[PDB]
Every structure is written in structure tokens, then in C-alpha cells.
CSV table of C-alpha atoms in Angstrom, one decimal:
chain,number,residue,atom,x,y,z
A,1,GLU,CA,0.2,-0.3,-0.3
A,2,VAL,CA,1.2,3.5,0.8
A,3,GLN,CA,4.7,4.0,1.6
A,4,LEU,CA,6.0,5.3,5.2
A,5,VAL,CA,10.0,6.1,5.0
A,6,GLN,CA,11.8,6.9,8.4
A,7,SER,CA,15.7,7.4,9.1
A,8,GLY,CA,17.4,8.9,11.5
A,9,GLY,CA,19.1,6.6,13.7
A,10,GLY,CA,22.8,6.5,14.7
A,11,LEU,CA,24.9,6.4,18.0
A,12,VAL,CA,24.4,9.2,20.8
A,13,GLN,CA,25.7,10.2,23.3
A,14,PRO,CA,23.2,10.5,27.1
A,15,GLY,CA,22.1,13.9,27.5
A,16,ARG,CA,21.9,15.5,24.1
A,17,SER,CA,19.8,16.0,21.2
A,18,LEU,CA,18.7,14.0,18.0
A,19,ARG,CA,15.8,14.0,15.5
A,20,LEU,CA,13.8,11.3,13.5
A,21,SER,CA,11.9,12.0,10.0
A,22,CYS,CA,9.4,10.3,8.7
A,23,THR,CA,7.9,10.9,5.2
A,24,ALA,CA,5.0,9.8,3.1
A,25,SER,CA,4.1,8.6,-0.1
A,26,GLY,CA,0.9,7.5,-1.5
A,27,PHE,CA,-1.6,9.8,0.3
A,28,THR,CA,-2.3,13.0,1.6
A,29,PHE,CA,-0.1,13.8,4.8
A,30,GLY,CA,-2.3,17.5,6.0
A,31,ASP,CA,-5.3,15.2,7.5
A,32,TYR,CA,-3.7,12.4,9.4
A,33,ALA,CA,-2.9,12.8,12.6
A,34,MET,CA,0.6,11.4,13.4
A,35,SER,CA,1.7,9.2,16.5
A,36,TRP,CA,5.3,7.5,17.6
A,37,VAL,CA,5.2,4.2,19.3
A,38,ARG,CA,9.0,3.2,20.6
A,39,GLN,CA,9.9,-0.4,20.6
A,40,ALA,CA,13.1,-1.5,23.4
A,41,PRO,CA,14.3,-5.2,24.3
A,42,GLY,CA,12.1,-6.5,27.2
A,43,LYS,CA,9.3,-4.8,26.6
A,44,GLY,CA,6.5,-4.3,24.4
A,45,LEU,CA,4.8,-1.8,22.2
A,46,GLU,CA,4.4,1.5,23.8
A,47,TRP,CA,2.9,5.0,22.6
A,48,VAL,CA,5.0,8.1,23.3
A,49,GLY,CA,3.3,10.7,22.2
A,50,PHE,CA,1.1,12.0,19.3
A,51,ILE,CA,0.1,15.5,16.6
A,52,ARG,CA,-2.7,16.2,15.6
A,53,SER,CA,-3.6,16.6,11.7
A,54,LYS,CA,-4.1,20.7,10.5
A,55,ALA,CA,-7.9,21.8,10.6
A,56,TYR,CA,-8.3,20.5,13.8
A,57,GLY,CA,-5.5,22.4,15.1
A,58,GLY,CA,-2.0,21.6,16.7
A,59,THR,CA,-2.7,20.4,19.7
A,60,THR,CA,0.1,17.8,20.4
A,61,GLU,CA,0.2,15.0,23.5
A,62,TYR,CA,2.8,13.0,24.9
A,63,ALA,CA,3.4,10.2,27.7
A,64,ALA,CA,4.0,10.7,31.5
A,65,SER,CA,7.9,10.2,31.1
A,66,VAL,CA,8.3,11.9,28.6
A,67,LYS,CA,6.6,15.3,29.0
A,68,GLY,CA,9.1,17.8,28.8
A,69,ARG,CA,11.6,15.8,27.7
A,70,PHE,CA,10.4,15.1,23.8
A,71,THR,CA,9.2,17.1,21.1
A,72,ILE,CA,6.9,16.6,17.7
A,73,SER,CA,6.5,18.5,15.3
A,74,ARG,CA,5.3,18.2,11.1
A,75,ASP,CA,5.6,20.3,8.1
A,76,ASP,CA,2.7,19.6,5.6
A,77,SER,CA,4.0,21.6,2.7
A,78,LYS,CA,7.4,19.0,2.3
A,79,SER,CA,5.2,16.8,4.4
A,80,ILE,CA,7.1,15.2,7.3
A,81,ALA,CA,7.0,14.1,10.9
A,82,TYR,CA,9.8,15.1,12.9
A,83,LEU,CA,10.6,14.3,16.1
A,84,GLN,CA,13.0,16.0,18.6
A,85,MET,CA,14.6,14.4,21.5
A,86,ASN,CA,16.9,16.6,24.4
A,87,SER,CA,18.5,14.9,26.8
A,88,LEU,CA,18.7,11.2,26.2
A,89,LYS,CA,18.4,8.7,28.7
A,90,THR,CA,20.8,5.5,28.2
A,91,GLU,CA,17.3,3.0,28.7
A,92,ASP,CA,15.5,5.0,25.7
A,93,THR,CA,17.8,2.6,22.8
A,94,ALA,CA,15.3,1.2,20.8
A,95,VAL,CA,13.4,1.4,17.5
A,96,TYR,CA,10.9,4.2,16.7
A,97,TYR,CA,7.6,3.5,14.5
A,98,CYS,CA,5.6,6.8,13.5
A,99,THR,CA,1.8,5.1,13.2
A,100,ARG,CA,-0.9,6.8,10.9
A,101,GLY,CA,-3.7,8.1,12.9
A,102,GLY,CA,-3.9,8.8,16.5
A,103,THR,CA,-6.5,6.3,17.6
A,104,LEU,CA,-6.6,3.9,15.1
A,105,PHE,CA,-3.1,3.1,14.7
A,106,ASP,CA,-3.7,1.4,10.8
A,107,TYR,CA,0.2,1.4,9.9
A,108,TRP,CA,3.1,1.0,10.7
A,109,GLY,CA,6.5,2.0,9.4
A,110,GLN,CA,9.5,-0.1,9.2
A,111,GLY,CA,11.4,1.9,12.1
A,112,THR,CA,15.1,2.8,12.6
A,113,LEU,CA,16.8,1.6,15.7
A,114,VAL,CA,18.7,4.6,17.3
A,115,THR,CA,20.5,3.8,20.4
A,116,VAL,CA,22.6,6.3,23.1
A,117,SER,CA,25.8,4.7,24.3
A,118,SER,CA,28.3,5.8,27.0
A,119,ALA,CA,30.9,3.5,26.0
A,120,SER,CA,33.4,3.1,23.6
A,121,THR,CA,34.3,1.0,20.5
A,122,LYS,CA,36.2,-2.5,21.7
A,123,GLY,CA,37.4,-5.2,20.4
A,124,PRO,CA,36.2,-8.7,21.3
A,125,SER,CA,38.0,-11.1,23.6
A,126,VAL,CA,37.4,-14.7,22.2
A,127,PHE,CA,37.6,-17.4,25.1
A,128,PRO,CA,37.1,-21.2,24.9
A,129,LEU,CA,34.7,-23.3,26.2
A,130,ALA,CA,36.0,-26.8,27.5
A,131,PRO,CA,32.9,-29.3,27.8
A,132,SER,CA,33.3,-30.5,31.4
A,133,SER,CA,30.1,-32.2,31.7
A,134,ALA,CA,30.3,-33.4,23.3
A,135,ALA,CA,29.2,-29.9,22.9
A,136,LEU,CA,32.0,-27.4,22.6
A,137,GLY,CA,32.5,-23.6,21.8
A,138,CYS,CA,33.4,-20.1,22.3
A,139,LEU,CA,33.0,-16.7,24.0
A,140,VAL,CA,32.8,-13.3,22.5
A,141,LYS,CA,33.1,-10.9,25.8
A,142,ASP,CA,33.5,-7.3,25.8
A,143,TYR,CA,33.0,-5.7,22.5
A,144,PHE,CA,31.2,-2.9,20.9
A,145,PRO,CA,29.4,-2.5,19.0
A,146,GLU,CA,27.3,-4.8,16.8
A,147,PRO,CA,27.1,-6.8,14.9
A,148,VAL,CA,30.0,-9.9,15.0
A,149,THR,CA,29.9,-12.9,12.9
A,150,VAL,CA,31.3,-16.4,14.1
A,151,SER,CA,31.9,-19.1,12.0
A,152,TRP,CA,33.4,-22.5,12.9
A,153,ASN,CA,36.3,-24.3,10.5
A,154,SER,CA,36.7,-21.1,8.0
A,155,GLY,CA,32.6,-21.9,7.1
A,156,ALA,CA,32.4,-25.8,6.9
A,157,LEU,CA,30.8,-26.7,9.4
A,158,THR,CA,27.6,-25.0,9.4
A,159,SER,CA,24.8,-27.7,11.2
A,160,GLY,CA,25.2,-28.3,14.7
A,161,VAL,CA,25.8,-24.2,15.1
A,162,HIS,CA,24.0,-22.8,18.0
A,163,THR,CA,24.9,-18.5,18.0
A,164,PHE,CA,22.8,-16.8,20.7
A,165,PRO,CA,22.0,-13.1,20.6
A,166,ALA,CA,24.0,-10.5,22.8
A,167,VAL,CA,22.3,-9.4,25.8
A,168,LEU,CA,23.6,-6.3,26.8
A,169,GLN,CA,24.6,-6.9,30.8
A,170,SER,CA,24.4,-4.1,33.6
A,171,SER,CA,28.3,-2.4,32.7
A,172,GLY,CA,27.2,-1.6,28.5
A,173,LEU,CA,29.1,-3.9,26.2
A,174,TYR,CA,28.0,-7.1,24.8
A,175,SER,CA,28.2,-10.8,25.1
A,176,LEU,CA,27.1,-14.3,23.6
A,177,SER,CA,28.3,-17.8,22.7
A,178,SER,CA,28.4,-20.1,19.7
A,179,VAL,CA,28.4,-23.7,21.1
A,180,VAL,CA,28.5,-26.3,17.9
A,181,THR,CA,27.4,-30.2,19.1
A,182,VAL,CA,29.6,-32.9,17.8
A,183,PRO,CA,29.9,-36.5,19.0
A,184,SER,CA,33.4,-38.1,20.3
A,185,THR,CA,40.8,-29.8,14.7
A,186,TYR,CA,37.7,-27.2,16.3
A,187,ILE,CA,38.8,-23.8,15.7
A,188,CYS,CA,35.8,-20.9,15.7
A,189,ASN,CA,36.7,-17.6,13.5
A,190,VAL,CA,35.4,-14.5,15.1
A,191,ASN,CA,35.6,-11.6,12.8
A,192,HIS,CA,34.8,-7.9,14.2
A,193,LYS,CA,34.1,-5.9,11.4
A,194,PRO,CA,34.1,-2.3,12.7
A,195,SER,CA,37.1,-2.5,14.0
A,196,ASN,CA,39.0,-4.9,11.3
A,197,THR,CA,40.0,-7.8,13.9
A,198,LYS,CA,39.8,-11.9,12.8
A,199,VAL,CA,40.6,-14.4,15.9
A,200,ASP,CA,40.6,-17.8,15.3
A,201,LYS,CA,40.6,-19.6,18.6
A,202,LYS,CA,41.0,-23.2,19.4
A,203,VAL,CA,38.5,-25.5,21.6
A,204,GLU,CA,39.3,-28.8,22.9
A,205,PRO,CA,36.9,-31.8,22.4
B,1,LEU,CA,50.0,-15.6,-5.3
B,2,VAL,CA,50.8,-13.8,-8.5
B,3,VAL,CA,53.5,-11.0,-7.8
B,4,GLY,CA,55.0,-13.0,-4.6
B,5,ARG,CA,55.8,-16.3,-7.2
B,6,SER,CA,56.3,-13.6,-10.2
B,7,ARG,CA,59.4,-12.0,-8.3
B,8,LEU,CA,60.7,-15.2,-6.4
B,9,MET,CA,60.9,-17.0,-9.9
B,10,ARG,CA,62.7,-13.8,-11.4
B,11,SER,CA,65.7,-15.0,-8.7
B,12,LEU,CA,66.2,-17.8,-10.5
B,13,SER,CA,65.5,-16.7,-14.0
B,14,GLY,CA,68.0,-16.3,-16.9
B,15,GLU,CA,69.4,-20.0,-15.6
B,16,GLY,CA,68.1,-22.8,-17.8
B,17,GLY,CA,65.4,-23.4,-20.3
B,18,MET,CA,62.8,-25.1,-21.8
B,19,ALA,CA,61.8,-27.1,-25.0
B,20,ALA,CA,58.9,-29.6,-26.1
B,21,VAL,CA,59.6,-32.7,-28.2
B,22,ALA,CA,57.2,-35.0,-29.7
B,23,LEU,CA,58.3,-38.6,-29.3
B,24,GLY,CA,56.5,-40.7,-26.6
B,25,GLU,CA,56.1,-41.3,-23.3
B,26,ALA,CA,58.3,-43.9,-21.6
B,27,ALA,CA,60.4,-43.2,-24.8
B,28,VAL,CA,61.2,-39.6,-24.0
B,29,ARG,CA,62.1,-40.7,-19.9
B,30,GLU,CA,64.5,-43.6,-21.8
B,31,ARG,CA,66.1,-41.0,-23.4
B,32,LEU,CA,67.2,-38.2,-20.5
B,33,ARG,CA,67.3,-41.1,-18.4
B,34,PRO,CA,71.4,-41.0,-19.0
B,35,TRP,CA,71.3,-37.8,-17.6
B,36,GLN,CA,69.8,-36.5,-14.5
B,37,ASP,CA,68.6,-32.8,-14.8
B,38,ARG,CA,65.2,-34.3,-14.2
B,39,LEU,CA,63.2,-35.7,-12.0
B,40,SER,CA,59.9,-36.2,-13.5
B,41,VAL,CA,58.3,-34.8,-16.5
B,42,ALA,CA,57.4,-31.2,-17.0
B,43,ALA,CA,53.8,-31.3,-18.6
B,44,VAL,CA,52.3,-33.6,-20.7
B,45,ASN,CA,49.7,-31.9,-23.0
B,46,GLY,CA,48.9,-35.1,-25.0
B,47,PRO,CA,49.9,-38.8,-25.6
B,48,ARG,CA,52.2,-37.7,-27.9
B,49,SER,CA,53.6,-34.5,-26.6
B,50,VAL,CA,55.7,-33.6,-24.0
B,51,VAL,CA,57.7,-30.8,-22.9
B,52,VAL,CA,61.4,-31.1,-21.6
B,53,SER,CA,63.3,-28.4,-19.0
B,54,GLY,CA,66.0,-27.4,-17.1
B,55,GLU,CA,69.5,-26.5,-16.9
B,56,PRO,CA,70.7,-25.4,-20.6
B,57,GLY,CA,74.0,-28.0,-20.6
B,58,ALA,CA,72.1,-30.9,-20.6
B,59,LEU,CA,68.7,-29.8,-22.6
B,60,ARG,CA,71.4,-28.6,-25.5
B,61,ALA,CA,72.7,-31.8,-25.5
B,62,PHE,CA,69.2,-33.9,-25.7
B,63,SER,CA,68.3,-31.2,-28.3
B,64,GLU,CA,71.4,-31.9,-30.4
B,65,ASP,CA,71.3,-35.4,-29.6
B,66,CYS,CA,67.8,-36.5,-31.0
B,67,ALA,CA,67.8,-33.8,-33.8
B,68,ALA,CA,69.4,-37.0,-36.2
B,69,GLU,CA,66.6,-38.9,-34.9
B,70,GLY,CA,63.1,-38.0,-34.7
B,71,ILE,CA,60.5,-34.8,-34.1
B,72,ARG,CA,61.9,-32.1,-34.7
B,73,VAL,CA,62.5,-30.0,-30.7
B,74,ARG,CA,60.7,-26.5,-30.4
B,75,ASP,CA,62.6,-24.6,-27.9
B,76,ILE,CA,60.2,-22.6,-25.9
B,77,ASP,CA,61.7,-19.1,-25.3
B,78,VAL,CA,61.2,-19.7,-21.0
B,79,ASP,CA,64.5,-17.6,-19.0
B,80,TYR,CA,63.8,-20.3,-15.8
B,81,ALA,CA,62.9,-24.0,-16.0
B,82,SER,CA,60.1,-24.4,-13.7
B,83,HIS,CA,58.7,-27.6,-13.0
B,84,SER,CA,62.2,-29.3,-12.0
B,85,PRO,CA,64.4,-29.4,-9.4
B,86,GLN,CA,65.8,-26.6,-9.6
B,87,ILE,CA,62.6,-25.2,-7.3
B,88,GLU,CA,63.5,-27.4,-4.5
B,89,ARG,CA,66.4,-25.3,-2.9
B,90,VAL,CA,64.4,-22.3,-2.5
B,91,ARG,CA,60.9,-23.2,-0.8
B,92,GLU,CA,61.4,-21.1,2.3
B,93,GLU,CA,61.3,-17.5,1.0
B,94,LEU,CA,57.5,-19.1,-0.9
B,95,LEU,CA,56.5,-20.1,2.2
B,96,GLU,CA,57.5,-17.0,4.4
B,97,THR,CA,55.5,-14.9,1.7
B,98,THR,CA,52.1,-16.7,0.8
B,99,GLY,CA,52.1,-18.3,4.8
B,100,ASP,CA,49.0,-16.1,4.9
B,101,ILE,CA,46.1,-17.7,2.6
B,102,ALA,CA,42.6,-18.1,3.8
B,103,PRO,CA,41.0,-20.7,1.5
B,104,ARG,CA,37.4,-20.3,0.8
B,105,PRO,CA,34.9,-23.0,-0.3
B,106,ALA,CA,34.6,-23.5,-4.3
B,107,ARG,CA,31.5,-23.0,-5.8
B,108,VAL,CA,32.0,-25.2,-8.8
B,109,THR,CA,33.7,-28.2,-9.2
B,110,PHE,CA,37.5,-27.0,-9.8
B,111,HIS,CA,39.2,-29.1,-11.0
B,112,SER,CA,42.5,-30.4,-10.4
B,113,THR,CA,45.8,-31.1,-12.8
B,114,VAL,CA,49.0,-31.5,-10.4
B,115,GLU,CA,46.2,-33.8,-7.2
B,116,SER,CA,44.1,-35.6,-10.7
B,117,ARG,CA,41.4,-35.3,-8.3
B,118,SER,CA,38.3,-32.6,-7.5
B,119,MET,CA,39.4,-30.6,-4.8
B,120,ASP,CA,37.9,-28.8,-2.6
B,121,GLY,CA,37.6,-25.1,-1.3
B,122,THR,CA,39.6,-25.7,2.0
B,123,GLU,CA,42.5,-27.8,1.0
B,124,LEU,CA,44.4,-25.0,-0.7
B,125,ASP,CA,47.7,-23.2,1.0
B,126,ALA,CA,51.4,-22.9,0.9
B,127,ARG,CA,52.1,-26.2,0.4
B,128,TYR,CA,49.5,-26.6,-2.8
B,129,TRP,CA,50.6,-23.9,-4.4
B,130,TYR,CA,54.6,-25.3,-4.7
B,131,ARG,CA,53.1,-28.6,-4.9
B,132,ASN,CA,51.7,-27.1,-8.0
B,133,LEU,CA,54.9,-25.3,-9.0
B,134,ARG,CA,57.3,-28.5,-8.4
B,135,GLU,CA,56.6,-31.7,-10.4
B,136,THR,CA,54.1,-32.5,-13.1
B,137,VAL,CA,50.8,-31.5,-14.0
B,138,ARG,CA,48.7,-33.9,-15.9
B,139,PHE,CA,46.4,-31.6,-18.2
B,140,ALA,CA,46.0,-34.4,-20.9
B,141,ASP,CA,44.6,-37.3,-18.7
B,142,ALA,CA,42.4,-34.6,-16.5
B,143,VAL,CA,40.8,-33.7,-19.9
B,144,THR,CA,39.8,-36.8,-21.0
B,145,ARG,CA,38.5,-37.9,-18.1
B,146,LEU,CA,36.8,-35.0,-17.6
B,147,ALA,CA,35.2,-35.5,-20.8
B,148,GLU,CA,34.2,-38.9,-19.7
B,149,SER,CA,32.2,-37.4,-16.9
B,150,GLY,CA,29.4,-35.5,-19.2
B,151,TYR,CA,31.0,-32.3,-19.9
B,152,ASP,CA,30.7,-31.6,-23.6
B,153,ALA,CA,31.5,-27.5,-23.6
B,154,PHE,CA,35.4,-27.1,-23.3
B,155,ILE,CA,35.3,-23.1,-23.6
B,156,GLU,CA,38.3,-21.7,-23.3
B,157,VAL,CA,39.4,-18.8,-21.9
B,158,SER,CA,42.8,-16.5,-23.1
B,159,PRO,CA,44.0,-13.8,-24.9
B,160,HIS,CA,45.6,-16.7,-28.0
B,161,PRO,CA,44.6,-20.3,-27.9
B,162,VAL,CA,47.5,-22.6,-27.8
B,163,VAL,CA,46.1,-25.8,-26.3
B,164,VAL,CA,43.0,-26.7,-28.9
B,165,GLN,CA,45.2,-29.1,-30.4
B,166,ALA,CA,46.1,-31.2,-27.5
B,167,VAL,CA,42.3,-30.8,-26.0
B,168,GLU,CA,40.4,-32.2,-29.6
B,169,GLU,CA,43.4,-35.0,-29.8
B,170,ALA,CA,42.6,-36.1,-26.0
B,171,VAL,CA,38.9,-35.7,-26.1
B,172,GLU,CA,38.6,-38.1,-29.5
B,173,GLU,CA,40.0,-41.3,-28.0
B,174,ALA,CA,37.3,-41.1,-24.9
B,175,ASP,CA,34.3,-43.3,-24.6
B,176,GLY,CA,32.0,-39.7,-24.8
B,177,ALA,CA,30.5,-37.7,-27.5
B,178,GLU,CA,32.4,-36.4,-30.3
B,179,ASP,CA,30.8,-33.4,-30.8
B,180,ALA,CA,32.2,-31.6,-28.2
B,181,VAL,CA,32.8,-28.1,-28.5
B,182,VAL,CA,36.4,-26.0,-28.1
B,183,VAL,CA,36.8,-22.4,-28.8
B,184,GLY,CA,38.7,-19.5,-27.6
B,185,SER,CA,38.7,-16.1,-26.9
B,186,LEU,CA,40.9,-14.1,-28.7
B,187,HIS,CA,43.4,-14.2,-31.7
B,188,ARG,CA,46.7,-13.2,-32.6
B,189,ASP,CA,44.5,-11.1,-36.0
B,190,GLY,CA,42.2,-9.3,-33.5
B,191,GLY,CA,41.2,-7.9,-29.8
B,192,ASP,CA,38.0,-6.3,-30.6
B,193,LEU,CA,34.3,-7.0,-30.1
B,194,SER,CA,33.8,-8.4,-33.0
B,195,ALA,CA,36.5,-11.4,-33.2
B,196,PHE,CA,34.9,-12.1,-29.4
B,197,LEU,CA,31.2,-12.0,-30.9
B,198,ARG,CA,32.3,-14.2,-33.5
B,199,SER,CA,34.0,-17.1,-30.8
B,200,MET,CA,30.5,-16.2,-28.8
B,201,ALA,CA,28.7,-17.3,-32.2
B,202,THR,CA,30.8,-20.4,-32.6
B,203,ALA,CA,30.0,-21.7,-29.0
B,204,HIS,CA,26.4,-20.6,-29.7
B,205,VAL,CA,25.5,-22.5,-32.6
B,206,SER,CA,26.2,-25.8,-31.3
B,207,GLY,CA,24.3,-26.4,-28.3
B,208,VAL,CA,25.5,-23.6,-26.0
B,209,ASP,CA,22.8,-21.0,-25.0
B,210,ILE,CA,24.2,-17.3,-25.4
B,211,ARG,CA,22.0,-14.3,-24.4
B,212,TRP,CA,22.2,-11.7,-27.0
B,213,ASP,CA,20.6,-9.0,-25.2
B,214,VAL,CA,23.2,-7.5,-23.3
B,215,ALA,CA,25.0,-6.6,-26.7
B,216,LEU,CA,22.2,-4.7,-27.7
B,217,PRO,CA,20.9,-2.0,-24.9
B,218,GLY,CA,19.8,0.4,-26.5
B,219,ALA,CA,17.2,-1.0,-29.4
B,220,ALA,CA,13.5,-2.1,-29.5
B,221,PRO,CA,12.4,-5.0,-31.3
B,222,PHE,CA,11.2,-5.0,-34.8
B,223,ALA,CA,8.4,-6.3,-36.6
B,224,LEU,CA,10.0,-9.7,-38.3
B,225,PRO,CA,8.6,-12.1,-41.4
B,226,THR,CA,7.1,-15.7,-40.3
B,227,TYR,CA,8.4,-19.0,-40.4
B,228,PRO,CA,8.7,-19.5,-44.0
B,229,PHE,CA,7.2,-23.4,-44.1
B,230,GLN,CA,8.0,-25.9,-47.0
B,231,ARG,CA,4.7,-27.8,-47.9
B,232,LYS,CA,4.0,-31.0,-50.2
B,233,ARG,CA,0.5,-31.9,-51.3
B,234,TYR,CA,-1.1,-34.2,-48.5
B,235,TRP,CA,-4.6,-35.2,-49.6
B,236,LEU,CA,-6.7,-37.9,-49.1
B,237,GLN,CA,-10.2,-38.2,-51.5
B,238,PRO,CA,-12.6,-36.5,-49.9
């Protein structure tokens, strides 16, 4: 159907500003109200605010936790919706969707994932995992930012591998594990691209 | 690989040569076995054509020695003598120049000519390319027993085809199909697009499917006549 195009994600420092941008193609932007929904891991959808279309005023409404911290603007001549954020906090690393309509959330955009971070970039530290219980793997710890790629036998062994999402701990750095299963030489190759490092660590079977 | 092998073989160049002879297989082995300039043959283009490489003295002696008792020898203008025991004493520089390779899996069946078998993409390292550089390449056997595997389009990719004779005279005797097509890319007397298009059409008229819309990126289809039928008179009494 109609297309909502969204942009404005990236890396942020806790306590500064950032503005999104959402354009609309296929329908008249000057007749619909616009709502904003944030999505962060460990929680569901959350309405954060909405703005009214013209011929009905220009009143804007926000949530309790963001009233006085965020603002929403629009331009119907060039037909964009803007979300401007001041004094961002580290718990708002999220993907933002723009929804057509104030109450009937009829349409949802593709969204952009924007994150506020206090830690700098860092190379990973891959440690072997010796079985002391068949399965064997390696742990990628204390790296920044996403993503990282893990391979076994330079892309030869692809069966039985169980990579895991990098859950953010309480510190601010990422850590995941990659474990394969083999009944009973064995190395895992971890590539961190934005820091340009490639480690090949052998794991004891 | 290319540049490192190039100037590592630059150092030993100027010293020894190569000559093509066509007299027999173990025949030529017996001819130069009275010499010890060579441990194994250099290459085998066909069942009747071989190349002898090595030090200038023994190569000259064999060329002038067999010049009176058989098929004439063509001295190939090679500055060095590869596929010879001359390679061995210079391994270590090679190992320390190309000992940093990451072999990836191969999409298509790369059929080796030094291991005489279908290799995998993960088995390519410093000794693989050394072994390539040192001992024989079995090209005639490889093309013959690839022709038996069900391949009938030996398209060459080279600025000048020099192995078409060997390819045909090798595929001729294999228990497969005879109408396997062998075409080059460019010749001595042309490098334009017309010659490449003619080679492509020669490959196409024998079964290979060629997409011809790439060469006309700015045209529109025309209105053409229909198929000319060839008719006789079939008429049963009505």
C-alpha cells in the first residue's frame, strides 16, 4: 500500500539531542494525525506521543515519562513528521515507529533503531569453552558495537551451531556465545568488522 | 600469489630453459634418464607431446642429440626452468611470502591438474601452490577423464588459444561424445569486439545458450516475417 519512509537512527551520547524524519508517499499527509511508538527489548509496544493534523488545530500530546523531554513537529508543505529528543537517557536505545492515525493505529512504518551509548568501541575477547559435563564453543565478550560474525572451520561446519543474541549486561558491553555439538581440529573464527579484527581460537574437544 | 611467485621466480630466471618434444612417453623418459637434470616430466599436453625443462647444458645436449633421430624439438623461450628440481632449494622464501592465505569454499567443481582429482575449496595453502610449482601437471589425463564425466563444452578463456589441438586430440579417444565443442576467446590478428562476438557465436551454434540482449542495450524489437514453411501436397480423396 502507501509507504512511510523513516530515517534518523544512529549512536547518541546520554544527554543530547536527535531528530527523526518520516515522509509519506501515496496519501495526503495533511489530513492524518501522527503517533509515535517506541520499541525496546524486554518490553512490548509503547505509545509515546501524538500530534493532530491541520483543520483540527495543532495540539500535541505526550506520555508521562517524556512530557518535557521530547517534542514532535511536522511540515505539511514538505510533508514530514519530526521527533526531536533532548537530554536522552541510556534506557531509550530503541526502534521508533511512526503510526498513521491518532487512535486507529492503522499503519506502521519500517522503523529505525537509534541508540544512546556511554561506552566506546572495543575489540572482542574470545575464550574457549572446554566440555566438562560433546558440545564445545567459544564466548565473545566485551566488544562494541554490533554486530559480530562467528564461523566454524572457515565456513565448513554449519550444522549444530547455536549462536546466541548478545544480551546487554549491566556494564554496557556485549557478550554472546557460539556452541556446536559433536560426538566423540575444532576452531572458531570471530570477525569484528568495524574494529577490523579476526581471531581464530581453537576449542578443546 | 601472482606477484610473490613472479619475483621469487625472477631470482632464479636467466638460468636454464625449456623445449617441446613429441617422440613418446616413457620413450623420452628413457632418452634423458642417462642424464640427471630432471626427476619427473614437466607437463603432458597429450599422449604424444611432452615438454622437457632443465639446465641449459643437458637441454642443449638432448636437443642436438635427438635432432638426428626423430621429431624436431622446438626450444620454448623460457628464461627459467620450472617444474624441475631447480625449484626445491628456494622453498622457504615462498613459504614465508604466501603463508597467509584463507581458503574459501569453491562454488564450482575446480578440477585440479596436480592432484588428478576434484579438490575442495578448503584444501588450498602454501604447499598446494608449491606442489603445483614443483612437479607435473596432468592436463591430458584431466581433460580426457573430464570428458567422460558428462562435460561437452570446453570453452577456453585466453587471449590466444594454444591448447586446442591437445584438447581435441585428447577428447577424441575417450568414451564420451565426439561433438564436444572447443572454442577460444581472442586470436593474434584481432582484439576487438567483433572477434569475441564471432567466438561467442561459434560456441552458441553448437548448443551453448547465449543471451544476446546484453550486446544491444539501446534497441527496440522490430516487426519481422514469420517462419517459411516447406509444403508438399497431402490430400486423401474427400
